[PDB]
C-alpha cells in the first residue's frame, strides 16, 4: 500500500474497537486504517491531595481489560492502537501541572498503562479539562512541555500524538525546549474541514483534514482526501467509526489516498 497514514478514533462508550480492522483495500488487502485511537481515558483531579491522575471509565476499563479480544487482534493485523487521554470536567488538564515533578508522575501513569495493556501509544485531547474547577490553576506554559518530555522519555519507541485543540495544544515550547518533535502525528479536530495544525511538524506527520465517518458527506470525505494527497500531507483523520456498514464512506477517501476502494468483513 502507498499513501497517507489513516487514523480512526472510536468512541468506546458506544462502539467496538474491532470495527477499525473490518476495513481493507480491495486491491492489495492493505488496512484502510493504520492507527486506531481508543477514545478516551481521562485526566481526573483529586481535590484532596491536589493531584491529577489517570482514569478509565467503565467502557475504557472494559476494552483495556479485554485487550486480547479488543486490541490485540487489531494489532496482529498491523494496526497501531493508541489510548486517547481527555479532560473530564475536574479542573485538571494537560496544561496546568504545577511542576515538572507533577507532570512526570502523570506521564508515568500513562506509560505504565500503555505498557500494562500492550498499547502502541497515547493521544492527547486537551478538551473538557474545564481549568479552574475545584480550585485549580489556569494553564501555565511549562506543564505540557514537562508532560510530553517525560512521556517520550518513558516510552521512546512508541507513539504519542496530539489532537489539535485546547490550551495544551498551543503550549509546546518552554525554556528552550520545543516538544513538537516528540510527537509522531498531530491532526485537525474539526470534522469536514481542512485546518492545518500549528504544531511544528513536517507535512508527513500532520493531518489538516478531519472527517466524521457517517456524518460528513462522502463528497467532502473525498475532496479532503484528495487535497491531502495533492498538498502532500501524510496523515488523514477519521472520527467516530461505528458498527454500521461504512464501506462507501471509507472508499470515499481510500480511493484518493491509496487508489483502491475498501471492503468490509
Swiss-Prot record:
Broadest EC class assigned to this enzyme: hydrolase
Catalytic activity: an N(4)-(oligosaccharide-(1->3)-[oligosaccharide-(1->6)]-beta-D-Man-(1->4)-beta-D-GlcNAc-(1->4)-alpha-D-GlcNAc)-L-asparaginyl-[protein] + H2O = an oligosaccharide-(1->3)-[oligosaccharide-(1->6)]-beta-D-Man-(1->4)-D-GlcNAc + N(4)-(N-acetyl-beta-D-glucosaminyl)-L-asparaginyl-[protein]
Stretches assigned to the GH18 domain: 4-260
GO biological process, one term: carbohydrate metabolic process
EC number: 3.2.1.96
Alphabetical keyword list: Glycosidase, Hydrolase, Signal
GO cellular component terms, A-Z: extracellular region
One Gene Ontology term of the molecular function aspect: mannosyl-glycoprotein endo-beta-N-acetylglucosaminidase activity
Disulfide pairings: none
Family: Belongs to the glycosyl hydrolase 18 family.
Name the UniProt record assigns to this protein: Endo-beta-N-acetylglucosaminidase H
Residues of the full protein shown: 48 to 312 of 313
Amino acid at each position: 500500500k502507498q499513501g497517507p497514514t489513516s487514523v480512526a478514533y472510536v468512541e468506546v462508550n458506544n462502539n467496538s474497537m474491532l470495527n477499525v480492522g473490518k476495513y481493507t483495500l480491495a486491491d492489495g488487502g492493505g488496512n484502510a486504517f493504520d492507527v486506531a485511537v481508543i477514545f478516551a481515558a481521562n485526566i481526573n483531579y483529586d481535590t484532596g491531595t491536589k493531584t491529577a491522575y489517570l482514569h478509565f471509565n467503565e467502557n475504557v476499563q472494559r476494552v483495556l481489560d479485554n485487550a486480547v479480544t479488543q486490541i490485540r487482534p487489531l494489532q496482529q493485523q498491523g494496526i497501531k492502537v493508541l489510548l486517547s487521554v481527555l479532560g473530564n470536567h475536574q479542573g485538571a488538564g494537560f496544561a496546568n501541572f504545577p511542576s515538572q515533578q507533577a507532570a512526570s508522575a502523570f506521564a508515568k501513569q500513562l506509560s505504565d498503562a500503555v505498557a500494562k495493556y500492550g498499547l502502541d501509544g497515547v493521544d492527547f485531547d486537551d478538551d473538557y479539562a474545564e481549568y479552574g474547577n475545584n480550585g485549580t490553576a489556569q494553564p501555565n506554559d511549562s506543564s505540557f512541555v514537562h508532560l510530553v518530555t517525560a512521556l517520550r522519555a518513558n516510552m521512546p519507541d512508541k507513539i504519542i500524538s496530539l489532537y489539535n485543540i485546547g490550551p495544551a495544544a498551543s503550549r509546546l515550547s518552554y525554556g528552550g525546549v520545543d516538544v513538537s518533535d516528540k510527537f509522531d502525528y498531530a491532526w485537525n479536530p474539526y470534522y469536514g474541514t481542512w485546518q492545518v495544525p500549528g504544531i511544528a511538524l513536517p507535512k508527513a506527520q500532520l493531518s489538516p483534514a478531519a472527517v466524521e465517518i457517517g456524518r460528513t458527506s462522502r463528497s467532502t470525505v473525498a475532496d479532503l482526501a484528495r487535497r491531502t494527497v495533492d498538498e502532500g500531507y501524510g496523515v488523514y483523520l477519521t472520527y467516530n467509526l461505528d458498527g454500521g456498514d461504512r464501506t462507501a464512506d471509507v472508499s470515499a477517501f481510500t480511493r484518493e489516498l491509496y487508489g483502491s476502494e475498501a471492503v468490509r468483513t
